[PDB]
Amino acid sequence: ALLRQAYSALFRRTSTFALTVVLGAVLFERAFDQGADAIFEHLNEGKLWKHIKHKYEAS
Amino acid sequence: IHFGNLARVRHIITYSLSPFEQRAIPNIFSDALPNVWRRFSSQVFKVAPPFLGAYLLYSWGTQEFERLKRKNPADYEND
Amino acid sequence: GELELHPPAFPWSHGGPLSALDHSSVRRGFQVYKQVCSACHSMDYVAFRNLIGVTHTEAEAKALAEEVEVQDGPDENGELFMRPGKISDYFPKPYPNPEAARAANNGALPPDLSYIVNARHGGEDYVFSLLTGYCDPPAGVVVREGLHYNPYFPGQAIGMAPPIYNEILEYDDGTPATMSQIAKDVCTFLRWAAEPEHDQRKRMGLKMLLISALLTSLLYYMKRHKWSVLKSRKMAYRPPK
Amino acid sequence: GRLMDRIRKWYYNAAGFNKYGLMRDDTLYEDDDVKEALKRLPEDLYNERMFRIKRALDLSLKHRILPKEQWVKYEEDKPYLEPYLKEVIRERLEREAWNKK
Amino acid sequence: VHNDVTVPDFSAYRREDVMDATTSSQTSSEDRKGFSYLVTATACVATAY
Amino acid sequence: ELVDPLTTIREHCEQTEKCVKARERLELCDARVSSRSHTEEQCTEELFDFLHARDHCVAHKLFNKLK
Amino acid sequence: APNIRKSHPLLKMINNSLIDLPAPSNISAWWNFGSLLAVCLMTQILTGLLLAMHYTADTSLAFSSVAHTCRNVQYGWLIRNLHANGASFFFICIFLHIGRGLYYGSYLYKETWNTGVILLLTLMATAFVGYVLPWGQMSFWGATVITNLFSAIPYIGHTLVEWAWGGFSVDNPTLTRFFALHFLLPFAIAGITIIHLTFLHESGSNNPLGISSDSDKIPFHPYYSFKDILGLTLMLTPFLTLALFSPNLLGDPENFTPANPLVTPPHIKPEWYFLFAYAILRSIPNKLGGVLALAASVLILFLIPFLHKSKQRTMTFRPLSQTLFWLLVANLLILTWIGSQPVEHPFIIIGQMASLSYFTILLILFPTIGTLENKMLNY
Amino acid sequence: WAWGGFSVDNPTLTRFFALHFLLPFAIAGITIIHLTFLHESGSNNPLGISSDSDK
Amino acid sequence: YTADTSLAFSSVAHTCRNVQYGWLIRNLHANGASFFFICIFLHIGRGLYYGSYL
Numbered sequence A: 001a002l003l004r005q006a007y008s009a010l011f012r013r014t015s016t017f018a019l020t021v022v023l024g025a026v027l028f029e030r031a032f033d034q035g036a037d038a039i040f041e042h043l044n045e046g047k048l049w050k051h052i053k054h055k056y057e058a059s
Numbered sequence B: 001i002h003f004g005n006l007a008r009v010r011h012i013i014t015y016s017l018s019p020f021e022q023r024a025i026p027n028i029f030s031d032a033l034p035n036v037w038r039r040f041s042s043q044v045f046k047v048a049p050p051f052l053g054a055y056l057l058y059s060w061g062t063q064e065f066e067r068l069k070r071k072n073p074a075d076y077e078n079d
Numbered sequence C: 001g002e003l004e005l006h007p008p009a010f011p012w013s014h015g016g017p018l019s020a021l022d023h024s025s026v027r028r029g030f031q032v033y034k035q036v037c038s039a040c041h042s043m044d045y046v047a048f049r050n051l052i053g054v055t056h057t058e059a060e061a062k063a064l065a066e067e068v069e070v071q072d073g074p075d076e077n078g079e080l081f082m083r084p085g086k087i088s089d090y091f092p093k094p095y096p097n098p099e100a101a102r103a104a105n106n107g108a109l110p111p112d113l114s115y116i117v118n119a120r121h122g123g124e125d126y127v128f129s130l131l132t133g134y135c136d137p138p139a140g141v142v143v144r145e146g147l148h149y150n151p152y153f154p155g156q157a158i159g160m161a162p163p164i165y166n167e168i169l170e171y172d173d174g175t176p177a178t179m180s181q182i183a184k185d186v187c188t189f190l191r192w193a194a195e196p197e198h199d200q201r202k203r204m205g206l207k208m209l210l211i212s213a214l215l216t217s218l219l220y221y222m223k224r225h226k227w228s229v230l231k232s233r234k235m236a237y238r239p240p241k
Numbered sequence D: 001g002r003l004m005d006r007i008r009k010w011y012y013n014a015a016g017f018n019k020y021g022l023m024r025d026d027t028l029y030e031d032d033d034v035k036e037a038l039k040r041l042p043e044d045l046y047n048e049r050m051f052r053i054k055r056a057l058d059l060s061l062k063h064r065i066l067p068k069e070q071w072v073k074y075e076e077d078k079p080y081l082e083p084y085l086k087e088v089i090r091e092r093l094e095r096e097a098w099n100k101k
Numbered sequence E: 001v002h003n004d005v006t007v008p009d010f011s012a013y014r015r016e017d018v019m020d021a022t023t024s025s026q027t028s029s030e031d032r033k034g035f036s037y038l039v040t041a042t043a044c045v046a047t048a049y
Numbered sequence F: 001e002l003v004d005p006l007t008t009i010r011e012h013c014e015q016t017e018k019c020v021k022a023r024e025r026l027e028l029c030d031a032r033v034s035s036r037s038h039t040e041e042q043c044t045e046e047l048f049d050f051l052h053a054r055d056h057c058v059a060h061k062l063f064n065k066l067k
Numbered sequence G: 001a002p003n004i005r006k007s008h009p010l011l012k013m014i015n016n017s018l019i020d021l022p023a024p025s026n027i028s029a030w031w032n033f034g035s036l037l038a039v040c041l042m043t044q045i046l047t048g049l050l051l052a053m054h055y056t057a058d059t060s061l062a063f064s065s066v067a068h069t070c071r072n073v074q075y076g077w078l079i080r081n082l083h084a085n086g087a088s089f090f091f092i093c094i095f096l097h098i099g100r101g102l103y104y105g106s107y108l109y110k111e112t113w114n115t116g117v118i119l120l121l122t123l124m125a126t127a128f129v130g131y132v133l134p135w136g137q138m139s140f141w142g143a144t145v146i147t148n149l150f151s152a153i154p155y156i157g158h159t160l161v162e163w164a165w166g167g168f169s170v171d172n173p174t175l176t177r178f179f180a181l182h183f184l185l186p187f188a189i190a191g192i193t194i195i196h197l198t199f200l201h202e203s204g205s206n207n208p209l210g211i212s213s214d215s216d217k218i219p220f221h222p223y224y225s226f227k228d229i230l231g232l233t234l235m236l237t238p239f240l241t242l243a244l245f246s247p248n249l250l251g252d253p254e255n256f257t258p259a260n261p262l263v264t265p266p267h268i269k270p271e272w273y274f275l276f277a278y279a280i281l282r283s284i285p286n287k288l289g290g291v292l293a294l295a296a297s298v299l300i301l302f303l304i305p306f307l308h309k310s311k312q313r314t315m316t317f318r319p320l321s322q323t324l325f326w327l328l329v330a331n332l333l334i335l336t337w338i339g340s341q342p343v344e345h346p347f348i349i350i351g352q353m354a355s356l357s358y359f360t361i362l363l364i365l366f367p368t369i370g371t372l373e374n375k376m377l378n379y
Numbered sequence H: 001w002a003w004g005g006f007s008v009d010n011p012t013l014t015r016f017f018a019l020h021f022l023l024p025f026a027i028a029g030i031t032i033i034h035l036t037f038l039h040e041s042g043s044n045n046p047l048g049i050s051s052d053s054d055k
Numbered sequence I: 001y002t003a004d005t006s007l008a009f010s011s012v013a014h015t016c017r018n019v020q021y022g023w024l025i026r027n028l029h030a031n032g033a034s035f036f037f038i039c040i041f042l043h044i045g046r047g048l049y050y051g052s053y054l
């Protein structure tokens, strides 16, 4: 039972609860941004400089 | 200090449950929605009317304003 | 003189709330401006460095800026002098001041285009309809010498002669330079000139929505949770009676 | 006349406080006169008013009302305070009048 | 007298696990708290972001 | 030579019940306005109704044929 | 004292107004606007300062300094957006706050009400001077149009005006004093807001049923702190959606053009939140009369406490008043609409109708219907 | 970060103006807190002994 | 005043030379800063000497 394990390990002692928020936010950021950017670029295929850049990128 | 000097109260019993023993959003279909509808119903005829009137006056005035910009052929039939 | 024609809504590729600008189109639009509009239209708020990472390469931008001579100084003897441009310079002004500008356009003043698509109702739809909307005046209407008829311009008599026509230039990317294709590109470019933050702004909008959806739901549950105590509360009146 | 005597019953139902199980007098804004009147109510009337009001507040927070069966009926509404309030005001007007004299 | 007083029935609101009067409510307590606290901790993470 | 999809679609659209009708009223106005010598009238209104209908039509299709 | 939350001279203050503060158990979402107004205020001040750190109060640099901020400052464009649009969130909230007060008789708390009127007046002055800062076309002309109204006051007319401009027209000296005023006023608002809440705490909050809630009070925390946080995110979403997806929806394109005193824009009209008053202004053709009308359109709020005739506090149980109330609300949307329209038929006549009904409803109908309703309750 | 660039320059000046305009108001604010704590005890006096006997 | 490196110095000069009593206000403000500190230092001194810090 994850809810119980969570409660015991993470949410019971206020110290661990804060630790869970911090460690939780660090992981949420990394994930959430990658996904958002991923979504945004897919919705705009070949329109961003990231996409057309190769055409003039060639010293 | 504002708790304890408020009102003379007698013979009222109240019962409540911890938030962890009950449901946050209970009986959505059996109680919630019916009431939402109930509330909407009881007010629609007090609120809607004037807003509807406003809309009309709006539409009229907007169209009437554009109609006055158009030309009346009855000013050039002579020539 | 009363009555005005309102442009139509074209389906720009950057119109969707989540749709960025087509940078390839912006790049061509820059070319149009640089080779056609920049002859009479200033774009004071944009600099060559702004192109870098958007429509051009750093090497490309540096070359573009060097094609221009800028006035620097004073020097040792307190003299002004010319020098080749740097990417930190802003697009060159066609005229020293407005008086000189009008002087070269029949007393008409071609406005700076840095914010044009936001300084006009209609935005790009307006600028686009205008560029491609020149035509002969209807019966009863006479355009005074020097002015050109455009139904999309208020008063319908604009001081700008149709600026673009088919093949008036060549896109070095190989796109067919038709008149409407050109107008479309320069308008997309104008959008970007007005708000370079455009793409980032929308990318942020996306993140704002997701987090807003997530967070609002979460907070709704919490509010409900706490209030459940009062919502389900029951009371009774029990007098000794 | 028995003309608006109907209008009243109409308004009474339009108002809707009876849906909260409240008496007309329960809904009075407690200005000074009303406050004095309330201090004069007998214990039982006072506690009944209190429960009715607390009950209404609880319904109001819940966004519910009483079942149709429990609504106060126009003709069964007790004007429990109107008598005291009428007295309180005369006394006041007496003093006011007398203090000018 | 108070002997005549009893707590109304909260079945219309009780959570599923404490609905049965003959079952210990403790066994599901870490479950009920774990869930609500999980919602809360997540709001904190969403807010910290 | 090259062809501007704009001009092409402008034609296809002028061949629309909506335009054809607006275009018709215009030519009538144009005719009588051109054939007098002391009238105020102008055909702006008529020209606008035409351009509005035509251009609204062009919008729907034009960007499809552009890069 | 046992807990340090009550003894401490400061925490005690924080506790008696945000934690152990007795609040009615039944106040609705309409009571959520006070806190939003506060947060809104903190936010304007914050984004304001951030903008001020890159602005230059000079006719020759104002416009471009704002442009430099949006184009060069890291997230300057975002801060600018949030500040400009935040002004609207502020007014939307303030109007709902007021509405709630009229509908529920919150105005019976006279001092809380009057300070409130003062907050609104100060907020308007703030937004007026703020708007001028970017020095665009509507910035300049709006400044001109409104300030010229005062030359209409006989005697101290031309004087008061030339004193305000610091010259013979809206020019640099005006811009610099307006920047100081804009920077300053928000702090008066914050100050007065404290007085507002101080008078308020004398009585505590009113509630939707209009009857004493002493029988059922709950601590502000967690009930309302949670309810309010929720209300914050609920409003904040549309706000951000607008500012991030449709940045210029509410603004005039005319302000993307450097002010020019030699070119009057065709349609000089204010931001939406002033339109209703702009309509009333123009309803009275006569410089002086219109100015008084404008003034009265807001000062009228100081009279509300004296036009209460009902024996009941709120409008919850007063259906005749309820419709009159919504009639009024619609009256306002109409004025808002007339305000954005040129001064021509049929807008002109409609405008005077709307202006006239506005004052009638508040001055004559509300008090009258209230009396009428008292009789229908056999009172 | 403080300069807003690589030396004291215009960006520094404009943020310094904002700060200068602002801080005085914080001083006024804090001054109120100052006097609030002070009123908990009341003024001290030159002999350093309780003045309750003579206020 | 004008917060710009190119106008600051002269805006203060314009104030002292053109604004009605601008020269007086400028003086009072600059010198008032000193009155402020003299006062604050005596305030503190008093406090140290009399144990107000307690």
Ligand code: HEC
Pocket: C032, C033, C036, C037, C038, C039, C040, C041, C105, C108, C109, C110, C111, C116, C120, C127, C157, C158, C159, C160, C161, C163, C164, C186
């Ligand atoms: C010969 C100089 C010249 C060229 C080249 C030119 N313009 Fe203009 N433009 C003008 C003039 C002159 C005006 C002023 C018209 C008036 O106000 O009567 C003007 C005005 C404008 C306006 C609209 C003004 C308004 O009030 O709506 C826009 C937009 C515009 N030009 C866009 C362009 C674009 C894009 C190009 C390049 C495709 C371009 N111009 C090239 C001369 C030119």
Ligand code: HEM
Pocket: G030, G031, G032, G033, G034, G035, G037, G038, G041, G094, G097, G098, G101, G104, G105, G106, G107, G109, G112, G113, G115, G116, G117, G119, G120, G123, G189, G193, G196, G197, G200, G204, G205, G206, G207, G301
């Ligand atoms: C910057 C503006 C304002 C701020 C920050 C502010 C803040 C608040 C806050 C926090 C409350 C408590 C919560 C609530 O009931 O909403 C409140 C209550 C109140 N305010 Fe305001 N307010 C503002 C403007 C005004 C205005 C313009 C009016 C009236 C013209 C007003 C009238 C009231 C009244 C009468 C109440 C009583 C609420 C009740 O009936 O319980 N306020 N205000």
Ligand code: HEM
Pocket: G041, G044, G045, G046, G047, G048, G049, G050, G051, G052, G053, G055, G066, G080, G083, G084, G087, G090, G123, G126, G127, G128, G130, G131, G132, G133, G134, G182, G183, G184, G185, G186, G189
């Ligand atoms: C009561 C809160 C405030 C309100 C209602 C408000 C309102 C406004 C308005 C309407 C504008 C015009 C925005 C635009 O269209 O460009 C503006 C601009 C500005 N405000 Fe505020 N403001 C507030 C507080 C402040 C504060 C406290 C400061 C800083 C001390 C500030 C600094 C500025 C600056 C520098 C601008 C100019 C840049 C710009 O126009 O974006 N404002 N403000």
Ligand code: HEM
Pocket: H027, H031, H034, H035, H038, H042, H043, H044, H045, I040, I043, I044, I047, I050, I051, I052, I053
């Ligand atoms: C803007 C600065 C300040 C303001 C407006 C201010 C104002 C006041 C006022 C009005 C009093 C009461 C009258 C008096 O005894 O002089 C007071 C007392 C006092 N202030 Fe300040 N003060 C300031 C700065 C300070 C500083 C810097 C200190 C110490 C580092 C300080 C320490 C005290 C203390 C300890 C008292 C107690 C006096 C006693 O022994 O009775 N104040 N202050």
Ligand SMILES: CO/N=C(/C(=O)OC)c1ccccc1CO/N=C(/C)c1cccc(C(F)(F)F)c1
Pocket: G121, G124, G125, G126, G127, G128, G129, G131, G132, G138, G139, G141, G142, G143, G144, G145, G146, G268, G269, G270, G271, G274, G277, G278, G281, G294
């Ligand atoms: C400096 O002008 N700022 C404008 C603006 O939109 O700021 C958001 C503006 C714009 C166009 C026309 C009129 C106005 C001026 O505002 N108009 C009215 C009509 C008004 C009405 C009542 C009160 C006040 C005041 F003084 F803020 F207190 C102003």
Ligand SMILES: CCCCCCCCO[C@@H]1O[C@H](CO)[C@@H](O)[C@H](O)[C@H]1O
Pocket: C200, C203, C204, C207, C208, C211, C212, E049, G236
């Ligand atoms: C209601 C709460 C809304 C908060 C939304 C936070 C989203 C802001 O996210 C921003 O997105 C930009 C574009 O990818 C990045 O460049 C910024 O670094 C990032 O902070």
